[PDB]
Every structure is written in structure tokens, then in C-alpha cells.
């Protein structure tokens, strides 16, 4: 562990075209001092492996506006208009990869495992390949994403993903001891921890350096063996992106969504309806809310004084945690998800098919990436519940035989709650209508649905919390 | 998390035939109260996925004694005479699995990854098949392991390994809060941590239950999402297998050690193998800092402990009680082997029964005599980014060659040894060139080494007398 007092001296030797792993989730755990040294070295050609594209005026968005990156490898690249500009113009190469695949690939690369199978992306364009990585000035495609090998194990289908290593890792942490051991604060750990392990040279910036012996040996997050270069950064803006401080049919879906929660349940809730449904959780039960950036035990939104840039949800909103909460890295978070340990994933959808295909991450000709959306639907052991308005404009269907928008997952939905009905959904049997909004008939449902469905013989009216 | 006061109740529904994941490394972090509960229920036919076989009177050894295990999946099964009687007689099936592969399959099992590739086992019985799983009454093999799928990535060969999941995991931890978050003490983490994630029903025993909020949210080793059933154990013997406290044929062995000590450099991360390599750590200059890594989940090993410092929760890979230095860390067995498998350790130093001309190593099996497992040895020699030095006596009994053209004992690794230190010679080892004799114990000539070595070798023009750390 070499200690440096110049952030430029820490990164002088990054050759043009390097692959650099960049820590951070949204603007949370961004190595803003090392990323500033790169603006100051002006190094170029880079392939940046980074979960997100920062924002325009911050994070990796800074090396983008200064044209220093050839290729971004990310999972979610929204909230950066300049990255959209460079991609569509053919100035930027972009590889979108599921978030949990991103985390596991980087981890694999650090752990000496050249490839592994994941259920995530099967039956989607991740498996199929062919999507533009790079356009020409024509609008013709200079680079297409390669297909992934599909293989079956114990009933389910999986795809082969290859490890990611880097030449360098730019990592932000909380404190280092003088031996080079490092800890991370709150949800700021995310991709920083695994990215420490997967590069030939890791550069870590910390907020503070402490003595050898300050950390309990059991509580070291990154052992010194992974830390090659260390600086204490001179300045930290730490800029909250979304400072989040404490219709008829939408409330209906919500008051029904709220009845999905049970005592002892581990749940991951998408932004919008599912998250709002959690406000109606009885205090006589406990639900444990998981966040993909590495939090179990999310609490309500923070009061003004409680807002902390190191604690955010997957929506990028400032959050709090309840007593009993835990933090963990992005690779551990997706092991929990991909492994089926979450009980309930509640999600929005643009389309759901008869046998449970879900389209929710991409509209052709309208370009943000999938995030953890594919990972959250990939486990058979986790109940997937979609909450959505029943129909689009013009009564255009959203429940159909075959989705026509790109799939998030194949045969992954277990139930659909709309303002008109609740359907159970099966891979092989299709839809059963188990509940119908009072006043409406089955034929009012049939006429706004794009496929056949069974009706439950215990078919009750629609419940409301 | 459901809390139980009755440990028999928490394991009462394990069915006959179950696959059970059992934590612990040696006798360290063994779920002793949960093992006792399985003795009370008498559940049989089990497949036990467990790193070692305890000892005769402790750990998994107790369930071997009561004949409740039909099959074992382990990396190292020595120091248990009842195990060896059951295995060799044909009563027990044993899948000897490299330790880091066992760690990563279990973690894969918890992580929803059905299969992955690893370099560990390539070039060995693990990859080619033929490892004995079950013996016949007459000592022939009834069941041998099958060939693994082999695949090349980036000019290296790897083998495909599948996830391991259990019906149940029996997990020892240190403390749990009342939400069911869990922490581990010292090197007692080991396999307990990943096994907690890889079973349909995980049962954890802890020594103390504390209040929600007694753990910083950053320092919860197992979040509550993984803990299904929790008990506070009634009694903890916490036996020590080897009380090794700080202080025959040592003449030529001191030679090897004083030369091997010169392989260390300031700032080096090293993993030292059982046997001779441990002893050269004492000869590491106090003018430098070497960082010593233990496969059971430690970085920054210190000296052997004074009596009053010895702790059952802190051992090395030789199952000896050890200490840690300031700046040390602890981590799980999957993370330990990610460090090793990923090439982050600078030097590995190992014993050998044989080394071949091109760097193959044989150090884990003597067919028909010694079948105790490879432990972490195959993993330690798996990385191209790590220097592998063998420390050994030059020749075997009867001046039988140990350095030879091809090994006759099952391989631990193919083309993996970089240097061989003996009491007569130091060889550099190239996978295409062969051996070069770079150092020679003064007073011996080159014909003395050739008459003791079972193959030819180049002689360095800068050949010098063999170095000894002053």
C-alpha cells in the first residue's frame, strides 16, 4: 500500500485506452477526487466500467463531457443527457449489462473465475445479442452486442457471462488504516468493494486515515492485500442527486398492492406504486425492505437534518434505515436476489404476457438500460408481483399473448394487480382471474385484456387495505 | 428468523437422506450443540458437506461414530481414525473436493449461480476423474469420480464446477441480535458464512443473543435474511485440536529453511504450507514485513501464542493455535480462496513428495496408503500470478528420487512450481525449458546433485553456493 499526497501522482500512469473500474452507485460512493485527477491528466480512450453514467455535471459524467471515454460498461445510464448525445451520434461505445451480472462479473474477475452461469438475461436481448454498442455517423451499427451461451441446469435456463477485470480501479472509501485496510460508510460501498479486487492496480481515496489497530480485525471490509494506492481526498462535495425529505385508479392498485405484504417478509419494491404501497403496511407486522445498492432494512424518508448522501435507495433518493439494518456490497446484494432469498419483488410493467413475460426496461426508439430489473425477476424462489394500470392510451392492451416490447424476463411474473383485476399467472397454464373490481364484470375485464384467462371458482371482488 | 430454546426442535424435521451443510474448519467454528441434537434424533443417510471430518470424538466425527452419514463432501479428512476405517472398508462414500472449489460451489449455491469455471483441479484426478469415492471390501475402488468438463479461456484451461446447496445448514456463529443478524469471531467464520446462504433451512447456533442495534449496520457478517432458525447453544467445549505454544532430522531441514527465508521480500503477501514452509517464517528478516495469509480466513498471521493467548477460534491451516498482528483481518473461506485463486498472494511455499522436470507437483495422495484430501493445495498452485516455491528434502528414503522427469504420484498441479529449494540445490523451473541448477550446497559438486535427481537440468553460468539467511 503506497500512500500518495497528490491525486494526480496516484493516477499519472493510466495509459490511454485503459480499462478503469469506477466505484459508485448513482452519485453515492463516487471517487470524485480521483476522477478529478483524470480530468487533470486528461487521459483518453478509456473503457469505463461503472454502474451508472453519473450526472452531467458530476461523477463519470465529467470524463464524458471531456471526451475521455471510448466505451462505458454500465447497467443504468439515465439522468445524463450528454451520454445519450454521444451514444446516438456514434462518439461513445456502450455495453449495457444487468446490474447483478455487472457485480458478479467484476467479482469473478477478482476471484480467478473466468466465467459463470446466471439466469439473468435469459430470454431477453442480453442472451440474444445484436444491440448497438456503437453506431456510425450513418445510423448504421459499427458494433453489436455478442450473444451469450444458453445452458440448462435442473430445469431452468441460464446464460454464460465472463469475468471483468480492469487495469485500474478508482475506488472511494470511508477510512483506511495505515496498513491499507479499508472500510466503507453506509450504502456508499456498492461497487467499490468488488472493484477493489478486480483490477491490476486499485487506487482508493478515503475521507480519513487512522492508525493500524483502529479497525476490529473481523470488521475490515477490504483487506490491505487489495489496496495498492491510497490517498485521503482533499475535498468532498458529496452531492445528493434526489434530496427526498419526509388519482382514483392508482390509489386502488396501491391499496390492493399493500395486501401482498406479510409479517416476516423480505421485499424489494420498485419506484412508484410498489414503494407507495409500503406506506399502508400495518405496524402490527414487520416487512424488511431490501435495496439493490446493498441495504436491508430501509426506513422512511429522512427529515432535513437526517439526509445523508451515503444512504440512498435504488431510486437514488435519500433514505433512512431502521434499527437492525445492514449494509453490504453490490455483489452480495445480487447474490441475495439471484439466489432467491427475497420473498416478494413488486414492480411496474409496460406489458405482461399470458405466461408471465415482463417488458419494463426499454421502448424501441425512446435508452436508459435495465438496472437490476432483470436480476430481480430471475429467481423462481421469489414471488414477482406486477402493479400496473390495466391499459395504455386508447385502451391499447398491456396484458397480452406475446409482449412486443423488449423483455425484462421470460415467464417470470406470478401475479398482476391492476385497477380492474388480480390475475395469478402460470408458465404453462396462463392467467387465472382471482379478483375483479366490484361493479365491473368479467367481460369488462375480457375486453380490456388481450388473451384468454381462467376465472377462479372462488372469484371474490377486489380487496382494498 | 425463528428463535428456539430446544435444539432438537430446530433440527427435528431434517429427513433421512438429507444433504446437510456443516460449518467449521478443523475444530474451529463447529456447531457443537446442533451436532448433538442430530445424535438425539438419530437422522441417518446424510450427505454431509463439511470441510473436514472433525476428530474421532468431536464435530462431524460424532455422526460418523453413530453411522448417521452415508456420504461426505470435504477437502481434508485426516486426524479421524473412525472416518478412515469407514472410508477404506467401503462403509462411507467420500468426495474429496479442493477446499476453494468447495467454498465457491457453496457460495454459488447461495448466489443463484448453478455452475462456474475454476482453474483448480486442472491436470489432476479432479479434472480427469478417478478420485476414489468408495472402496470395495477388498480395498479396490467401487466408485471413482468422473471427468470434469474442461474449457479454455484466454489461453488457460479451466474446469466446470456446479453449485452445492443443502436441505439444511448447521452454522456456528458468535453472536446474533434479536432481528437475527449474525457475527463470527476470529477464524471461526470459515465455511459457516457461505453455508448460511446455501441451504433451504439454515440453523445457526450462537453463544450470545444481543439487542437489535448492538451491531453497526456496516459490520453484520450475515444479514438476518439468511438466518431461518436461531438457537443460543447451551454448552461450548471449544476444544483445541493442537495447542501450539511459543518457544530429529533438523540438520538438513534448517538448511532448507534458511534458504527459503531468503525468498521473502518487504511488502509480500505469502501463504505458507504445512511442513517445512511454516518454519522459515521465523527466519523472515525483522528488517522487512511479510504479510502471511491463512486459507481458513486470516491475513496478518503473527507468531505462535503464549499459553495465555491461545484461542480455539484462532488457528492456521495446519490446525495449530496462532496469533494475529496489528492490522490483521478475518474473512470467510470463499473470500480466502478468491484471494488465492485470483492471484493476489505473491508467494506460495509448499512441501512436496515429488516435483517434475517441468514443474508438476505431487503432494496430496499416495494411492493405497494416504488418501486424506488435497485441502487447499490445488488452489494454492492454481494462479499464474503467484510464485510457487517447493521446499523439500532432495531425495526420499533409499535415495529414491523426488525430483524427476514425470511424477508417479497423483498430481496436485501441472506445470506450477517456479522454484525448488532442497538441502543440496536450488532449481529454477520452466514449463518449456525444464530445470536450471542455480545454487548448490557448497562442498557438493554438480554430479552429487545429478546422482540424487531423477532427470537432467541446465547449470546456470552464474551458479553459486546455496544462500543462507544470516
- Between B181, B221, B337, which is nearest A324 by CB? B181
Q: Rounded to an integer, what distance in angstroms lies between the CA atom of residue B18 and that of residue A465?
A: 42
The neighbour count for residue B242, using CB atoms within 10 Å, is 14
- Between B221, B299, B340, which is nearest A223 by CB? B299
Q: Does A221 touch chain B (CB under 8 A)?
A: yes
A186 to B104: CB separation less than 8 angstroms, yes or no: no
On chain B, the residues whose CB falls within 8 A of the CB of A226 are 344
A326 to B223: CB separation less than 8 angstroms, yes or no: yes
Reference A297, options A271, A278, A274; nearest CA is A278
Judge residue B150's burial from the number of C-beta atoms within 10 Å of its C-beta, 0-12 exposed, 13-18 middle, 19 or more buried.
Answer: middle
B250-464 architecture in CATH? Answer: 3-Layer(aba) Sandwich (3.40)
Query: B400 CB contacts (<8 Å, ≥6 apart)?
Result: none
CATH topology of domain A247-460: Glutaconate Coenzyme A-transferase (3.40.1080)
On chain B, the residues whose CB falls within 8 A of the CB of A340 are 112
- Between B213, B293, B344, which is nearest A226 by CB? B344
Reference B191, options B96, B281, B110; nearest CA is B110
B217 to A325: CB separation less than 8 angstroms, yes or no: yes
CB A450 within 8 A of CB A399: yes
Angle made by CA atoms A306, A312, A318, in degrees to the nearest 5: 40
CB B28 within 8 A of CB B321: no
B224 to A324: CB separation less than 8 angstroms, yes or no: yes
- Between B185, B269, B327, which is nearest A212 by CB? B327
A153 to B115: CB separation less than 8 angstroms, yes or no: yes
Residue A85 CA, chain-centre distance (Å), reads 22
Q: Rounded to an integer, what distance in angstroms lies between the CA atom of residue A306 and that of residue A245?
A: 9
Which position has the grid cell 452486442?
A145
A117 to B113: CB separation less than 8 angstroms, yes or no: yes
- Between B111, B153, B224, which is nearest A114 by CB? B153
The neighbour count for residue B389, using CB atoms within 10 Å, is 23
Nearest residue in chain A measured CA to CA from B336: A111
Question: Chain B neighbours among A 129-158 (CB < 8 Å)?
Answer: 151, 153-154, 156, 158
On chain A, the residues whose CB falls within 8 A of the CB of B197 are 335, 339, 341
In SS3 terms, chain A reads as: CEECCCHHHHCCCCCCCCEEEECCECCECCCCCHHHHHHHHCCCCEEEEECECCECCECHHHHHHCCCEEEEEECECCCCHHHHHHHHHCCCEEEECCHHHHHHHHHHHHHCCCEEEECCCCCCHHHHCCCEEEECCCCCEEEECCCCCEEEECCEEEEEEECCCEEEEEEECCEEECCCCEECCHHHCCCHHHHCCCEEEEEEEECEEECCCCCCHHHCCECHHHCCEEEECCCCCCCCCECCCCCHHHHHHHHHHHHHCCCCEEEEECCCHHHHHHHHCCCCCCEEEEECCCEEEECCCCCHHHCCCCCECCCCEECCEEEEEEECCHHHHHHHHHCCCCCEEEECCCEEECCCCEECCCCCCCCCCCCCHHHHCCCCCCEEEEECCCECHHHCECEECCCCCCCCECCCCCEEECCCEEEEEECCCEEEEEEECCCCCHHHHHHCCECCCEEEEEEEECCCC
Judge residue A138's burial from the number of C-beta atoms within 10 Å of its C-beta, 0-12 exposed, 13-18 middle, 19 or more buried.
Answer: exposed
B327 to A118: CB separation less than 8 angstroms, yes or no: no
Nearest-CA distance A321 → chain B (Å): 9
CB B164 within 8 A of CB B106: yes
On chain A, the residues whose CB falls within 8 A of the CB of B383 are 112
A112 to B213: CB separation less than 8 angstroms, yes or no: no
Q: Rounded to an integer, what distance in angstroms lies between the CA atom of residue A334 and that of residue A360?
A: 19
CA distances from residue B3 to B7, B112, B210, B459 in whole angstroms, order as listed: 10, 26, 13, 68
On chain B, the residues whose CB falls within 8 A of the CB of A199 are none
Q: Rounded to an integer, what distance in angstroms lies between the CA atom of residue B146 and that of residue B130?
A: 6
Nearest-CA distance A181 → chain B (Å): 7
Note the CATH number of domain B1-233. Answer: 3.40.1080.10
Q: What is the DSSP letter of B229?
A: E
B328 to A158: CB separation less than 8 angstroms, yes or no: no
Reference A184, options A389, A25, A370, A327; nearest CA is A327
Query: A461 CB contacts (<8 Å, ≥6 apart)?
Result: A435, A436, A437, A438
Question: Chain A neighbours among B 382-411 (CB < 8 Å)?
Answer: 382-383
Q: Please check whether the two domains, A1-233 and A247-460, share a CATH topology.
A: yes
Reference A293, options A381, A148, A192; nearest CA is A192
Reference B54, options B319, B364, B374, B304; nearest CA is B319
A114 to B341: CB separation less than 8 angstroms, yes or no: no
Q: Rounded to an integer, what distance in angstroms lies between the CA atom of residue B270 and that of residue A410?
A: 47
Q: Does A228 touch chain B (CB under 8 A)?
A: no
A179 to B110: CB separation less than 8 angstroms, yes or no: no
Residue to test with chain B: of A157, A183, A324, A337, most B Cβ within 10 A: A324
Domain boundaries, chain A: 1-233, 247-460
Q: Rounded to an integer, what distance in angstroms lies between the CA atom of residue B230 and that of residue B455?
A: 59
Q: Does A324 touch chain B (CB under 8 A)?
A: yes
Q: Which of B263, B295, B320, B439 is catalytic?
A: B295
- Please list the residues that pair with A46 across neighbouring strands: A69
Nearest residue in chain B measured CA to CA from A290: B225
Q: Does B345 touch chain A (CB under 8 A)?
A: yes
Nearest-CA distance B13 → chain A (Å): 21
A224 to B329: CB separation less than 8 angstroms, yes or no: yes
Reference A445, options A392, A390, A394, A393; nearest CA is A390
A186 to B226: CB separation less than 8 angstroms, yes or no: no
Question: Chain B neighbours among A 179-198 (CB < 8 Å)?
Answer: 179, 181, 183-186, 189, 197
Catalytic residues of A: 292
Cell of A425: 399467472
Angle made by CA atoms A362, A314, A112, in degrees to the nearest 5: 85
Q: Does A160 touch chain B (CB under 8 A)?
A: no
**Resolution reached, in Å?**
2.2
DSSP-derived 3-state class of residue B54: coil
Nearest-CA distance A41 → chain B (Å): 28
CB A334 within 8 A of CB A104: yes
B112 to A118: CB separation less than 8 angstroms, yes or no: yes
On chain B, the residues whose CB falls within 8 A of the CB of A337 are 112
Amino acid at each position: 500500500t503506497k500512500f500518495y499526497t497528490d491525486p494526480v501522482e496516484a493516477v499519472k500512469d493510466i495509459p490511454d485506452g485503459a480499462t478503469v473500474l469506477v466505484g459508485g452507485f448513482g452519485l453515492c460512493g463516487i471517487p470524485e477526487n480521483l476522477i478529478d485527477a483524470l480530468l487533470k491528466t486528461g487521459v483518453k480512450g478509456l473503457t469505463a466500467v461503472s454502474n451508472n453514467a453519473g450526472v452531467d455535471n458530476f461523477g463519470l459524467g465529467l470524463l464524458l463531457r471531456s471526451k475521455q471515454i471510448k466505451r462505458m460498461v454500465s447497467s443504468y445510464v439515465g439522468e445524463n443527457a450528454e451520454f445519450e448525445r454521444q451514444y446516438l451520434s456514434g462518439e461513445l461505445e456502450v455495453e449495457l449489462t444487468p446490474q447483478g451480472t455487472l457485480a458478479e462479473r467484476i467479482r469473478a474477475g477478482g476471484a480467478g473465475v473466468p466465467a459463470f452461469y446466471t439466469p439473468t438475461g435469459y430470454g431477453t436481448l442480453v442472451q440474444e445479442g445484436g444491440s448497438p454498442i456503437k453506431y456510425n455517423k450513418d445510423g448504421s451499427v459499427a458494433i453489436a452486442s455478442k450473444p451469450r451461451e444458453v445452458r440448462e441446469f435442473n430445469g431452468q435456463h441460464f446464460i454464460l457471462e465472463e469475468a471483468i477485470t480492469g487495469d485500474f480501479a478508482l475506488v472511494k472509501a470511508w477510512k483506511a488504516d495505515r496498513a491499507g485496510n479499508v472500510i466503507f460508510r453506509k450504502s456508499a460501498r456498492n461497487f467499490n468493494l468488488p472493484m477493489c479486487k478486480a483490477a491490476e492496480t486499485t487506487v482508493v481515496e478515503v475521507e480519513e486515515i487512522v492508525d493500524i489497530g483502529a479497525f476490529a480485525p473481523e470488521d475490515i471490509h477490504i483487506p490491505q492485500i487489495y489496496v495498492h494506492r491510497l490517498i485521503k481526498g482533499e475535498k468532498y462535495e458529496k452531492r445528493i442527486e434526489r434530496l427526498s425529505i419526509r388519482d382514483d385508479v392508482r390509489e386502488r392498485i396501491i391499496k390492493r398492492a399493500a395486501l401482498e405484504f406479510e409479517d416476516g417478509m423480505y421485499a424489494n419494491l420498485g419506484i412508484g406504486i410498489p414503494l407507495l404501497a409500503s406506506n399502508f403496511i400495518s405496524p402490527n407486522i414487520t416487512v424488511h425492505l431490501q435495496s439493490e445498492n446493498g441495504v436491508l432494512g430501509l426506513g422512511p424518508y429522512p427529515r432535513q437534518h437526517e439526509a445523508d448522501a451515503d444512504l440512498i435507495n435504488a431510486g437514488k433518493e435519500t433514505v433512512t434505515i431502521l434499527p437492525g439494518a445492514s449494509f453490504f456490497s453490490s455483489d452480495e446484494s445480487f447474490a441475495m436476489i439471484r439466489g432467491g432469498h427475497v420473498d416478494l419483488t413488486m414492480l411496474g410493467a409496460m406489458q405482461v404476457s399470458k405466461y408471465g413475460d415482463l417488458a419494463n426496461w426499454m421502448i424501441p426508439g425512446k435508452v436508459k438500460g435495465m438496472g437490476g430489473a432483470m436480476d430481480l425477476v430471475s429467481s423462481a424462489k421469489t414471488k414477482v408481483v406486477v402493479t400496473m394500470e390495466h391499459s395504455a392510451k386508447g385502451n391499447a392492451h398491456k396484458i397480452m399473448e406475446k409482449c412486443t416490447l423488449p423483455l425484462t424476463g421470460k415467464q417470470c411474473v406470478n401475479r398482476i394487480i391492476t385497477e380492474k383485476a388480480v390475475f395469478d399467472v402460470d408458465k404453462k397454464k396462463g392467467l387465472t382471474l382471482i379478483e375483479l373490481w366490484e361493479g365491473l364484470t368479467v367481460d369488462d375485464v375480457q375486453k380490456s385484456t388481450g388473451c384468454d384467462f381462467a376465472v377462479s371458482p372462488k372469484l371474490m371482488p377486489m380487496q382494498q387495505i
